[PDB]
Design a protein around this ligand. Structure first.
Ligand SMILES: Cc1cc2nc3c(=O)[nH]c(=O)nc-3n(C[C@H](O)[C@H](O)[C@H](O)COP(=O)(O)O)c2cc1C
Lengths: 170, 845
């Protein structure tokens, strides 16, 4: 237990740094030249440095070429890659279901669609924040395929509507 | 009326025309009596084990019978029943037959009696296929490479089986070649009396002499040329493309030590007769090279003592070539001059050929090379020495050096006297090559043969014998697909030139063997060249300059972020902060930084009871912006921490706190322990940082067992950590990076001494392998531990922060000499457990 004394120097003998031990890296030390600066600003410096270099290596100093996405993240570190055949949307879309075309994951992706929009994020995400409380996504449970049901995402994903044949009526 | 073939437990039903069932039946009576009796699961090499193979033996048996009008109808029925929309792509169907579980997985029962009989019974294949793969010139490029001498020990059965299966596509070719071979044979007698009749040897295997005679350069040179000629002719014939117009589909071509003759002959050919004539001239030259390279420097009897001692030390049978691996060129050249300081100029050892930065081959008399490897064994260390416990900077050089299967000291001064005689033979016969069409890159200079004042043959003979091989200078490619028609297959030039071009967008397609598919799909096989699909016919290689290159993105509020394979999971910068027991236990260093939008994990070493962890996590969550999550850095060495932390994480995740990551500290856990981590307690990714090559293998094993859950590797190279596992930051991953990336769910980030954009960008982009002569090797992210200690948020004492500031750094290659002196104010000291610790050099330290 010789690790905390560097943190709390006011406690040790006569507040002498040379008596305490600080764990640090020989390779990263030359990069540490500023003192008492925000960690956010440090990671910034690195982030916009990468911005600048990555622009000035292939984007020819133009940020318009950058492929802007609506929300950054979600389905895996790679670019979102579900079953590409079933990654589809459309203006007038209704999804008839049977026993031939159910399966949990592919149905969820089929409902999600292609564009990284609000609906795709809402359906695809594996977690919902409840006042800073990561819980399971309820869409996964409630959008489970059911016999003789129907999902309508008409008008370019403005709204999803799921129907089931209650008392023999959809 | 349907016709049903039965054999053992397998039957095949086909709809034959009515007024043939009589004479279609007579063949059947003759087919059942030619096949072996069933034995324990169709295990006979001649025995069918699939309906397609059974019908293929039917269609091949009917070919030896003089009875037309059925053979082509049967071929069409086979194509319709088994080859849907790929009727001229049987190579894909054969290798897909392997993936079936009913068929016992083996290549012997697939390649022959399916592909052999198909092309034995096929009509003229002069049908131009969907050759749109090269039609996009700016997107696809084809380069033909040709192997050299000694790619394999038993090269002869390559040509044996190629004649065995592709007799119909090479029958008019090999007879014509061997006719010239036997015409030119008598002028070079008394040196190989056992004959040079390939046709008699292939038709009668008992006429073929021993492999000691066969593997000799004078015999193997014409045979290797015939091998590559047959491979190219089969390549042009299966697609039904004229070689003159198939050459148009190629951008440029070059070859190995021996293969340059084929590389330049490949463009002198326009028609089938012209290609035959040029092959006839080429095969004649190789007879002269083999004859005069043996008469100029005849290999004499070698005592059994030296070869026995070389074999007992793990080497090969001594040869004019000594291949040394795993050392740089500047080291090999340093050692060879020391070795030759005790040798004359007649036995001198000089750089002969360079397969890479860490694979060279030296040339000289066998006793001189055995004197070289005696020294190298004195300088080296065993494989089982366990280099992990002594620092890398002061370990011993590791190598595996042995001799190649070639019987002539090529690419040195020794054959420099032979060249003047060799060119004389060129003048003695009609050895001449007409105008070059595709550029051919020089093996030594790297230039084109078109802009030459001197002829071609008289200079390639100088190149093969005297000029050294700078192999990578010749193959400075600008292309996507590389096709090897030469010997070796998996044991030849193709794999070692793939290793030099792993991420440069080069897709290696093996035309020598057809036994796809490898478990990693590093390289393709014969089927890929002949695929006729529009966009599915081309398998693209990992282009790690563009594929895993970072991109960017703009926000709706006007701010810009980085799009990578770590940032996308993070939804933020691909720049994490590692968990530190002193540093990252402050609620403020984690909370006040997450509000900025960057990823940090809390180290559990600064907390000693679950109530303290819960009180810290609750405080961080209460002040961060709602929706962000935090990681937890755990430590594996102490079981107490594990047993009070793992239950805490499980039920805090069941509650639903933003606990987001679990970085396990030093010591990669077992598969069973990591099993419940991944499945039961519900995280997004698992931080599982290793510290050794064995640990990296263990984490890859952990990644295989769970091919759904992301695993951030976080491989630290022990350069800047607290408990630095002392290893190089490059070597443990330079050899196993493309053993990690065979994972749909692996994440690879790197730490150990990162502080700024300039030193981290090469690792993300992948250009960090340029100094080590490797393809671009991108990293998903980079973790920072020592550069954020001087941050405002950190509660480390301001005076210690100052001491760090005036504490200077260490250049990378010197980091490991921190065991003696205050290298940049930082030394390594032993812990109470024996683990090395980096500490600021102070009076206490
Ligand atoms: C003060 C300090 C404490 C650290 N504590 C831990 C730890 O408890 N567990 C661990 O796995 N790594 C620990 N590390 C190592 C970091 O996790 C990281 O791997 C290392 O700092 C390499 O990055 P760097 O070169 O920028 O320091 C510590 C590093 C420092 C500087």
């Amino acid at each position: 237990d010789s690790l905390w004394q560097s943190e709390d120097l006011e406690s040790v003998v006569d507040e002498d740094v040379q008596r305490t031990c600080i764990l640090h890296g020989p390779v990263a030390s030359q990069y540490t030249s500023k003192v008492d600066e925000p960690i956010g600003d440090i990671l910034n410096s690195i982030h916009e440095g990468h911005i600048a270099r990555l622009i000035k290596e292939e984007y020819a100093g133009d940020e318009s070429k950058i492929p802007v996405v609506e929300y950054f993240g979600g389905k895996k570190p790679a670019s979102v890659s579900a079953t590409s055949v079933n990654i589809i949307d459309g203006n007038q879309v209704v999804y008839e279901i049977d026993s031939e075309l159910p399966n949990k994951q592919e149905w969820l992706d089929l409902l999600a669609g292609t564009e990284l929009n609000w609906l795709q994020a809402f359906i695809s995400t594996d977690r919902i924040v409840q006042g800073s409380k990561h819980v399971s996504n309820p869409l996964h449970d409630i959008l489970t395929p059911a016999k003789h049901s129907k999902v309508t995402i008409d008008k370019k994903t403005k709204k999803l509507t799921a129907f089931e044949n209650i008392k023999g009526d959809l | 009326r349907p016709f049903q073939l039965t054999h053992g437990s397998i039957e095949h039903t086909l709809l034959v025309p009515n007024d043939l069932f009589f004479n279609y039946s007579q063949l059947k009576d003759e087919f059942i009596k030619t096949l072996p009796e069933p034995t324990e699961g169709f295990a006979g090499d001649d025995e069918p084990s699939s309906p397609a193979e059974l019908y293929g033996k039917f269609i091949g048996f009917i070919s030896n019978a003089q009875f037309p009008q059925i053979v082509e109808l049967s071929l069409k029925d086979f194509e319709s029943r088994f080859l849907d929309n790929n009727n001229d792509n049987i190579h894909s169907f054969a290798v897909k037959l392997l993936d079936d579980e009913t068929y016992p997985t083996t290549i012997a029962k697939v390649k022959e009696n399916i592909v052999k009989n198909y092309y034995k019974a096929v009509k003229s294949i002069n049908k131009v296929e969907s050759n749109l793969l090269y039609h996009c010139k700016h997107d696809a490029k084809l380069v033909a490479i040709f192997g050299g001498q000694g790619n394999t020990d038993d090269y002869f059965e390559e040509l044996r089986e190629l004649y065995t299966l592709y007799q119909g596509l090479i029958e008019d070719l090999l007879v014509s070649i061997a006719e010239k071979l036997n015409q030119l044979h008598p002028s070079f007698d008394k040196i190989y009396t056992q004959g040079l009749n390939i046709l008699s040897w292939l038709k009668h295997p008992e006429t073929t002499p021993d492999q000691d005679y066969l593997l000799s350069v004078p015999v193997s040179c014409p045979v290797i040329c015939v091998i590559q000629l047959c491979h190219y002719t089969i390549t042009c014939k299966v697609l039904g493309l004229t070689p003159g117009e198939f050459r148009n589909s190629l951008k440029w071509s070059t070859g190995h030590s021996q293969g340059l003759v084929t590389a330049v002959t490949i463009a002198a050919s326009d028609s089938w007769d012209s290609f035959l004539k040029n092959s006839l001239t080429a095969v004649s030259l190789l007879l002269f090279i083999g004859s005069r390279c043996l008469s100029t420097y005849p290999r004499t009897s070698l005592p059994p003592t030296m070869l026995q001692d070389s074999l007992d030390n793990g080497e090969g049978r001594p040869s004019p070539m000594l291949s040394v691996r795993d050392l740089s060129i500047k080291q090999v050249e340093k050692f060879i001059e020391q070795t030759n300081s005790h040798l004359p100029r007649e036995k001198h050892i000089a750089i002969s050929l360079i397969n890479g930065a860490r694979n060279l081959v030296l040339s000289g008399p066998p006793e001189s090379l055995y004197g070289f490897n005696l020294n190298l064994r004195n300088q080296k260390a065993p494989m089982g020495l366990d280099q992990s416990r002594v620092p890398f900077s002061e370990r011993k050089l590791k190598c595996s050096n042995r001799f190649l299967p070639i019987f002539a000291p090529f690419h040195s001064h020794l054959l420099a006297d032979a060249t003047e005689l060799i060119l004389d033979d060129v003048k003695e016969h009609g050895l001449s090559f007409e105008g070059l069409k595709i550029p051919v890159y020089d093996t030594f200079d790297g230039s084109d043969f078109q802009a030459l004042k001197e002829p071609i043959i008289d200079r390639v003979v100088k190149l093969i014998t005297e000029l050294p091989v700078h192999w990578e200078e010749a193959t400075n490619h600008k292309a996507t697909h590389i096709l090897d028609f030469g010997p070796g297959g998996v044991s030849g030039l193709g794999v070692l030139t793939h290793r030099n071009k792993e991420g440069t967008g080069a897709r290696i397609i093996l035309a020598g063997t057809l036994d796809s598919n490898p478990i990693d799909d590093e390289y393709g096989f014969k089927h890929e060249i002949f695929q006729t699909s529009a966009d599915k016919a081309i398998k693209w290689a990992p282009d790690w300059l563009k594929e895993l290159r970072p991109t960017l993105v703009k926000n709706s509020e006007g701010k810009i972020y980085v799009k990578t394979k770590f940032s996308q999971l993070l939804g933020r910068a691909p720049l994490m902060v590692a968990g530190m027991t002193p540093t990252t236990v402050n609620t403020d260093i984690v909370s006040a930084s997450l509000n900025a939008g960057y990823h940090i994990e809390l180290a559990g070493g600064g907390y000693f009871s679950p109530v303290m962890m819960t009180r810290a996590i609750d405080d961080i969550v209460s002040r961060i912006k709602p929706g962000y999550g935090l990681g937890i850095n755990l430590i594996y060495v102490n079981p107490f921490m594990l047993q009070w932390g793992i239950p805490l994480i499980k039920d805090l995740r069941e509650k639903g706190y933003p606990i987001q990551s679990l970085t396990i500290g030093a010591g990669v856990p077992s598969i069973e322990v990591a099993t419940e981590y991944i499945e039961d307690l519900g995280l997004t990714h698992l931080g599982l940082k290793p510290g050794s090559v064995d640990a990296i293998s263990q984490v890859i094993a952990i990644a295989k067992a769970h091919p759904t859950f992301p695993i951030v590797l976080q491989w630290t190279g022990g350069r800047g950590g607290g408990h630095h596992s002392f290893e190089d930051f490059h070597q443990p991953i330079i050899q196993m990076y493309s053993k990690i990336r065979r994972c749909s769910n692996i994440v690879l980030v790197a730490g150990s001494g990162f502080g700024s954009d300039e030193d981290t960008y090469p690792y993300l982009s992948g250009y960090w392998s340029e100094k080590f002569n490797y393809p671009p090797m991108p990293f998903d992210g980079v973790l920072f531990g020592s550069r954020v200690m001087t941050s405002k948020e950190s509660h480390t004492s301001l005076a210690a922060k100052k001491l760090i500031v005036e504490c200077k750094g260490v250049p990378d290659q010197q980091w490991e000499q921190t065991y003696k002196k205050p290298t940049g104010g930082i030394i390594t000291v032993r812990s109470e457990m024996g683990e090395p610790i980096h500490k600021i050099a102070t009076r206490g330290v």
